[PDB]
Amino acid sequence: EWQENKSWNAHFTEHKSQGVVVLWNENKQQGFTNNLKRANQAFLPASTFKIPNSLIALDLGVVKDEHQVFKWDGQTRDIATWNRDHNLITAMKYSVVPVYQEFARQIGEARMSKMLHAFDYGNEDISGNVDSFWLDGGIRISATEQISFLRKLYHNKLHVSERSQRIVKQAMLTEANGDYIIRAKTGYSTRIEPKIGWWVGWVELDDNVWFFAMNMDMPTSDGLGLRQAITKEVLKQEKIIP
Amino acid sequence: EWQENKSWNAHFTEHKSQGVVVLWNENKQQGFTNNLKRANQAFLPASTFKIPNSLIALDLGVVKDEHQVFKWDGQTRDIATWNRDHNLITAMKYSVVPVYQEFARQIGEARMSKMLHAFDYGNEDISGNVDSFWLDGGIRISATEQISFLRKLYHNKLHVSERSQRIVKQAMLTEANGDYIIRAKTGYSTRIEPKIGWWVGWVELDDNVWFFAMNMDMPTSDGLGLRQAITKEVLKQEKIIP
Ligand SMILES: CCCCOC(=O)[C@@H](NC(=O)c1c(-c2ccccc2)noc1C)[C@@H]1[NH2+][C@@H](C(=O)O)C(C)(C)S1
Ligand SMILES: Cc1onc(-c2ccccc2)c1C(=O)N[C@H](C(=O)O)[C@@H]1N[C@@H](C(=O)O)C(C)(C)S1
């Protein structure tokens, strides 16, 4: 079952914005969205690709553990937080593209292609530069295919080791308190039209898990905070979080 | 209820191919597929677009009835059956692209877009050339979206006349005997990757209707007969046909 709930369109209208939110209730095995068509439209994943990229780099030994230091290469880039030493935890937190480009070059085309076929990930197409196909190449994924992928990660059912899956879930930690835990990854696709923002992940409660995937039109970086704000307005209306 | 049935994958691996078959049982309102992900992935419709294009041409009076002759323009093309006079029945049987390109020019961009919105047909996007957008422009549709559309046609529920719907169902007639009737349309998309074959339609029994939509990888035109043969192997396994 998928069920359409157009009342969530209010949360987008409030900000003169357009997009989709998809929720999956793990206990009841039912899905909900404001737009069934856009829920199945495939886009470039941009920084959401850092979840499968991390899994592959750990399983092949390109990354030894979550404390290994990746030293700054000395090139001043326009994002201040990229101009420093990182590990896996900080490289995911600050979406540090140059660290992930170096992992992809060491994984290589052949192993990257075989791993994405085993994950059943989006359209499985890596055409383009081995170190930029998720930003300006031929790979495409829908919000519903993001949920399918994330459910397998949650249950340790991807073909890679239990250990690789546990470390990446630790790196995805975004928020936690007495009411909920959020594990998630942001993305911003800016190189090829149409320009879109992503937020994909899940909410852990005492007795259930809600998986989510949202995308929205992002003509400039001024609206990037709306990825989390709009998603949290839907979770409150559904009584998932206070 | 959607159920995944991976035993059907044997009919694709037998012929060294890959694809999806989707079935819908009208009496039970239940669907079956070998591949839930591919069942909801969007592709160019190619010649399966002759179903909506026929419906719109009839309803606007571009085509008067099933007997009206469309005289060959006297340009020699590749397919020998295209180099002769046609009516609606023979144009759909032989998939005569040049006849349908002239229908699209007389319908025009504004009326074509309005009718695809009224039908809820795929992504409803006609961007590209008015006479080739279903071959190489922006329009996309999934196997499950082809079923939704065909169910409305079967029940005379699309927003055109009853007369337009009855004449198109006549032009779709493919096979009939004492056990079953098949109404359907073939497609073959090669202008954009991946290259795919389509077969969409339904099977009329004495007391039920089974809707189907299949697509499969088609690297050369040598495998085109597999569109029908693999679909009939699934129908036989499920005891829908003898
Ligand atoms: C190795 C250098 C790679 C840069 O790779 C990009 O394509 C990045 N994009 C941009 O720097 C932007 C932005 C913009 C502006 C303000 C704040 C954020 C982004 N506007 O246009 C371009 C071009 C990175 N791509 C994103 C992603 O991978 O999701 C990002 C948020 C990490 S930012
Ligand atoms: C979480 C998170 O937690 N803290 C910050 C933060 C705090 C202060 C400064 C910068 C970031 C942060 C965040 O925003 N991280 C961003 C993110 O991945 O969503 C990335 N980094 C941005 C950038 O460095 O500007 C970017 C536009 C490259 S995408």
Side-chain angles (χ1 to χ4, degrees):
Chain A
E1 292 253 48
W2 290 94
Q3 284 179 259
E4 197 162 49
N5 184 335
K6 307 253 285 297
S7 86
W8 302 348
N9 288 143
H11 303 301
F12 285 101
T13 293
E14 257 297 315
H15 304 270
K16 294 176 136 193
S17 69
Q18 287 165 241
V20 70
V21 173
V22 189
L23 304 185
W24 182 264
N25 179 340
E26 188 66 4
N27 281 348
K28 305 286 198 203
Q29 296 281 297
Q30 288 190 104
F32 304 94
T33 185
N34 63 301
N35 189 337
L36 283 165
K37 288 187 178 311
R38 180 166 181 156
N40 288 293
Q41 185 182 358
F43 301 99
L44 282 150
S47 284
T48 68
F49 193 75
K50 288 181 180 64
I51 300 165
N53 207 354
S54 299
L55 285 173
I56 293 164
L58 284 151
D59 217 55
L60 293 183
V62 170
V63 170
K64 292 306 180 200
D65 64 32
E66 69 276 23
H67 299 118
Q68 174 175 11
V69 181
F70 318 113
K71 316 272 195 236
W72 180 37
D73 63 2
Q75 302 196 15
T76 305
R77 307 185 169 84
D78 303 333
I79 311 284
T81 59
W82 294 9
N83 301 324
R84 74 180 63 157
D85 296 358
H86 282 285
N87 57 37
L88 188 73
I89 307 299
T90 67
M92 190 168 291
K93 179 180 179 183
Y94 296 105
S95 295
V96 183
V97 170
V99 167
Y100 278 86
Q101 289 183 304
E102 179 61 29
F103 299 166
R105 288 192 291 263
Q106 294 179 217
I107 291 159
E109 281 180 74
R111 292 191 299 186
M112 186 74 78
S113 186
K114 296 208 212 87
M115 285 277 205
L116 293 185
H117 178 60
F119 293 168
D120 193 36
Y121 189 93
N123 73 350
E124 296 168 36
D125 178 0
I126 67 159
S127 304
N129 301 306
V130 74
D131 63 354
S132 85
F133 66 83
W134 63 91
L135 303 161
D136 56 22
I139 192 154
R140 304 282 187 283
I141 195 165
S142 71
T144 63
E145 295 160 357
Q146 292 263 28
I147 295 189
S148 299
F149 173 73
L150 288 172
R151 293 185 62 237
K152 291 184 195 61
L153 177 58
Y154 180 83
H155 288 297
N156 290 337
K157 296 303 203 154
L158 292 168
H159 87 97
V160 293
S161 65
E162 173 172 339
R163 175 186 179 272
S164 301
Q165 286 174 98
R166 288 191 179 278
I167 295 162
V168 168
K169 278 182 286 184
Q170 178 187 353
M172 290 172 65
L173 172 62
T174 300
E175 201 179 359
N177 55 47
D179 295 320
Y180 64 76
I181 302 169
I182 297 172
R183 306 187 184 273
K185 185 69 195 79
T186 60
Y188 187 20
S189 178
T190 56
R191 296 201 184 182
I192 302 302
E193 288 300 323
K195 291 195 185 46
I196 64 152
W198 285 103
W199 202 38
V200 307
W202 62 81
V203 187
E204 303 179 9
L205 306 179
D206 294 333
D207 57 327
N208 202 4
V209 185
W210 288 84
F211 295 84
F212 68 84
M214 81 87 65
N215 63 64
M216 64 183 292
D217 298 343
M218 195 62 58
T220 77
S221 55
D222 296 325
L224 281 171
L226 298 179
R227 294 166 304 174
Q228 303 97 332
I230 292 178
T231 304
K232 279 179 141 177
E233 286 301 307
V234 169
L235 295 174
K236 295 184 159 131
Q237 172 176 341
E238 294 312 305
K239 309 303 173 45
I240 291 160
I241 68 175
Chain B
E1 262 160 292
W2 280 99
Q3 290 178 250
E4 205 179 43
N5 188 334
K6 292 193 137 215
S7 73
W8 298 350
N9 285 326
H11 305 301
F12 287 105
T13 65
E14 173 59 10
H15 298 95
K16 321 208 170 228
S17 67
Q18 311 214 302
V20 67
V21 178
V22 184
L23 304 182
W24 184 267
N25 179 335
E26 188 63 4
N27 281 351
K28 298 180 112 97
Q29 297 288 283
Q30 288 181 112
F32 305 89
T33 189
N34 59 308
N35 191 331
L36 275 171
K37 177 182 87 166
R38 188 173 174 142
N40 286 294
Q41 281 178 319
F43 304 91
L44 280 153
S47 285
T48 64
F49 193 73
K50 289 182 175 69
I51 301 175
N53 202 4
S54 298
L55 283 169
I56 296 164
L58 286 158
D59 212 60
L60 293 184
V62 169
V63 172
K64 296 180 165 147
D65 60 35
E66 69 273 23
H67 295 114
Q68 179 181 3
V69 174
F70 308 103
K71 298 194 265 323
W72 178 42
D73 62 4
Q75 303 180 60
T76 305
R77 301 181 174 76
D78 213 355
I79 317 286
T81 56
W82 293 9
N83 301 327
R84 58 174 79 146
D85 298 349
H86 280 290
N87 57 41
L88 191 66
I89 309 304
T90 62
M92 191 170 269
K93 178 171 175 187
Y94 294 110
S95 199
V96 187
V97 179
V99 164
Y100 282 83
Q101 295 177 300
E102 181 62 20
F103 297 165
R105 288 180 208 113
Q106 297 179 205
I107 292 159
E109 283 184 35
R111 293 194 291 173
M112 185 74 78
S113 181
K114 174 185 153 190
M115 298 291 287
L116 296 184
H117 286 290
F119 293 169
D120 205 50
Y121 186 92
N123 69 358
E124 307 169 17
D125 182 348
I126 66 153
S127 72
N129 297 311
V130 78
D131 71 353
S132 78
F133 63 87
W134 65 94
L135 302 169
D136 55 25
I139 193 131
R140 303 286 186 280
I141 188 162
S142 67
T144 62
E145 294 178 319
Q146 294 264 25
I147 302 274
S148 293
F149 172 76
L150 294 164
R151 291 184 67 233
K152 290 179 189 106
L153 178 54
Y154 177 82
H155 291 296
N156 293 336
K157 277 192 194 287
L158 296 165
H159 299 151
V160 289
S161 72
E162 178 174 330
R163 187 175 171 274
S164 295
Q165 293 173 93
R166 291 198 178 275
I167 294 176
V168 175
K169 287 185 283 183
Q170 182 182 355
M172 291 172 58
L173 177 61
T174 293
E175 195 179 353
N177 56 46
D179 301 318
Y180 64 80
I181 300 168
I182 295 172
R183 299 183 190 280
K185 183 74 192 79
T186 56
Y188 178 32
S189 173
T190 66
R191 293 193 176 180
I192 302 296
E193 291 298 293
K195 295 188 186 66
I196 62 149
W198 280 107
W199 203 39
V200 307
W202 63 81
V203 184
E204 300 175 13
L205 306 176
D206 284 350
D207 75 331
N208 203 5
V209 181
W210 285 89
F211 297 82
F212 70 80
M214 82 86 69
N215 65 63
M216 60 174 301
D217 296 350
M218 193 59 59
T220 70
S221 53
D222 295 339
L224 283 176
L226 295 177
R227 298 175 293 178
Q228 297 97 333
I230 295 171
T231 308
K232 278 173 145 186
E233 285 301 316
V234 169
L235 295 174
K236 268 151 169 158
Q237 182 177 332
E238 301 300 329
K239 305 169 179 310
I240 291 161
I241 66 171

